[PDB]
Amino acid sequence: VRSFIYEPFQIPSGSMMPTLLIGDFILVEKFAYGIKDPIYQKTLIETGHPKRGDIVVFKYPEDPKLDYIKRAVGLPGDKVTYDPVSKELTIQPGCSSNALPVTYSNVEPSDFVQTFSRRNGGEATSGFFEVPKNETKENGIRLSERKETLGDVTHRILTVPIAQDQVGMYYQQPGQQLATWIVPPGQYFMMGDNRDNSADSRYWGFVPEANLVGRATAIWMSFDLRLSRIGGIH
Length: 234
Prior knowledge:
The protein has one helix spanning about 200-205, and strands at about 1-5, 5-10, 25-30, 30-35, 45, 55-60, 65-75, 80-85, 90, 100-105, 110-115, 125-130, 140-150, 155-160, 180, 185-190, 205-210, 210-220.
């Protein structure tokens, strides 16, 4: 006697590359589901919770009028530390006041190249393009790829070899060094797979449970007419 609500979701940005791409249309399963008991035919309202590594759609805390999609990397109580040089995560569960095994595969060239306009000789991102590994684009940088295993979940991330986060721009948590955060009760730390192209928890803080919409379950369609991407999230 249980029911789940599902809603389609268009992928607007490349913050989740290479896992999710601009043009992807995904299925999202709401955390809040109905529980129709037995004796009575009522519909109890129970809410599920994201597991570490889940790809989650949520309402932007600063402006809940917009929905974002990131990977839930930090759970309540998690002590999250990000090394901007190695671009690696360290996660220590239950440190609200034991190190989780987070491993990374070897850096390899990805299928994408990020380009940038050059008005005035400066640089501004101008898009992502799938480019054969033996080719290049002028004013573009080949992005690197590797696998991140957050405990039991393994997924891919992209990195921009010429970039490095400016720690001073991070959301700084009271009483904490820059680049370290303790996830508050009932809140989450969100990060996108395209690690140098993601305005996430590093910059605007945690996501309250109530802002959560649902978990991404599949790519129902994608229009960069990529029938090849329909299926599970990889």
